[PDB]
Amino acid sequence: QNQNIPRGAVLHSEPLTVMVLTATDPFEYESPEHEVKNMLHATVATVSQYFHVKVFNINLKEKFTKKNFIIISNYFESKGILEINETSSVLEAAPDQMIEVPNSIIRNANASPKICDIQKGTSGAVFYGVFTLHKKTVNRKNTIYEIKDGSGSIEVVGSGKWHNINCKEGDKLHLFCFHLKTIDRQPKLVCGEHSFIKISK
């Protein structure tokens, strides 16, 4: 711990134009020092790639609206996820900087992984996606959300803000930035600091 770039992460200084595809509202979370912090999640695309983005400056909420074009620089990339820090630059693109993102990229960005492919993951691998709730178990300390698709079932462990969420079997759980851990010799998805869940009917 001597530079702020995480282990195995990369600093990108050069400007990158992206189109915003989706974004969450700002939400509060807790830092390891128990400070209340604020961020949002977003998905953005270039003409050739999409990225999930952790946005650590909620003053950027209006810039991260669907179909807006923005230019990012001085941001980190870690495990394929972009991180927009308070020190990052995020500017509104000019008309001559807008780009044409193919629909295939947008469909891809919006696709969820199958649970069987999540189950193949290495310890610590990070996943996002929308899954059907099969079974919920609220414990003293955390909640087990068992999600299922045609490829398999897996447990999602929620604690803190993600403990005892208001949902029922059959609802869809939109998971942001969960990661794989081995518990009872079986892959489970668990929260990290920046995890988020949204429920839909």
Sign (positive/negative) of CA torsion 78, 79, 84, 86?
Answer: negative
What is the radius of gyration, based on Cα positions, of the chain? 17
Q: Which of 88, 111, 134 is the last residue of a domain?
A: 111
22: tokens are 């989706």
Instruction: Give the separation between CA 106 and CA 48, rounded to whole angstroms.
Output: 10
Q: What is the resolution of this structure in A?
A: 1.9
The helix or strand, by DSSP H or E, that contains position 31, with its residue range, turns out to be none
Identity at 137, one-letter amino acid code: T
Please indicate, yes or no, whether residues 166 and 101 belong to a single structural domain of this protein.
no
Q: Which parts of the chain are beta strand (E)?
A: 9-12, 16-23, 27-30, 36-45, 50-55, 69-73, 75-78, 81-84, 89-92, 126-138, 143-149, 152-158, 172-183, 186-190, 196-200
Angle at 8 between CA 53 and CA 79, to 5 degrees: 35
- The residue type found at 187 is P
Do strands 9-12 and 16-23 pair parallel, antiparallel, or not at all (unpaired)? unpaired
In 3-state terms, what secondary structure has residue 73?
A: strand
Structural domain of 55 = 1-111
Method: X-ray
CA distance 70 to 98: 8
Residues 192 and 149 in one domain: yes
Q: Are residues 103 and 181 in the same domain?
A: no
Name the domain count of the chain.
Answer: 2
